[PDB]
Structure 1
Amino acid sequence: SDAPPLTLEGIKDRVLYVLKLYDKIDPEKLSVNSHFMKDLGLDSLDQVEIIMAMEDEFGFEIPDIDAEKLMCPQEIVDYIADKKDVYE
C-alpha cells in the first residue's frame, strides 16, 4: 500500500541513525541539539560529508546555501521537515 507517512519522529530517528554510522562523531555525547563544530569537534569538510549522508538517506538534493546553515542535528530535522511539508 502507500508507504508510511513521514513524521517528525521518523525524521529525527533517521538523522540520528545517519550520524551514528559516521565514524567521527562520538555516539555518547550526541544529542538532537549538539553543535557540530563547538561540541562534536568536526571541521568544515566533515560537516559537508554529513550533509551528503543526509542526501542519500532521504533522496533529495541539499544545496550549499542551505547546507551551511544546517549546523546541528536539530536544524537538519527542521530543514528536512520543511522540504517534505511534514508539519506533524
Structure 2
Amino acid sequence: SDAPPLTLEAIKDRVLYVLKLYDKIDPEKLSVNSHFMKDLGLDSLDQVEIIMAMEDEFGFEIPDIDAEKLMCPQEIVDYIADKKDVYE
C-alpha cells in the first residue's frame, strides 16, 4: 500500500543514524539524551545544519520557532512523533 506506519523506535533509529553520520560528533559519545551545546559542544549553526538534515531525512519542514527549541535527539524524535500522529 502506502508507507508503513512509522513507529517511535523507527524514528529514534533514523535520527540516531543521521546524527552518527555527522563528522563533528563522536558516535560512541552520542546518546539519545545528549545536549547539542552542553554535551556535544556545537554552536547554533551546527544545530541549524542538524535540523536541516532531519528535514531532508524525513521529508517535511520544521518551522524555525519550533526548530530553535529541539536540543537533544529525544526532543527531535518527540517533535516528529507529535507531528506525524505516532503513538506506538
> If the TM-score is normalised by the length of the shorter chain, which range does it land in?
over 0.9
Deviation string, structure 1 residues 60-83 (Cα, Å, up to 9, x no partner):
111110001101101000000000
Shift of 1:12: 0.2
| Cα separation, 1, equivalents of 2:76 and 2:16 | 10
Provide the rounded CA distance (Å) in 2 between the counterparts of 1:48 and 1:2. 31
TM-score by length of 2: 0.96
TM-score normalised by L of structure 1: 0.96
1:19 alignment partner in structure 2: 19
Q: Deviations over 1:6-31 (max 9, x none)?
A: 00000000000010111101111100
Structure 1 portions without partners, runs of 5+: none
Tell me which protein shows more helix as a share of its residues. Answer: 1
Spell out, residue by residue over 1:15-60, the C-alpha distance to the aligned partner (whole angstroms, 9 max, x if none).
0001011110111110000001000111110000000000000011
Q: Distance in 2 between matches of 1:28 and 1:60?
A: 28
- Matched residue, 1:31: 31
Deviation at 1:5, TM superposition (A): 1.2
- Percent identical residues: 99
Mapped partners of 1:36, 1:57: distance in 2: 19
Partner of 1:25, secondary structure, is: coil
Answer yes or no: is 1:42 the counterpart of 2:42: yes
Deviation at 1:3, TM superposition (A): 2.3
Count of residue pairs the alignment pairs up: 88
Structure 2: where are the runs of 5+ without partners?
Answer: none
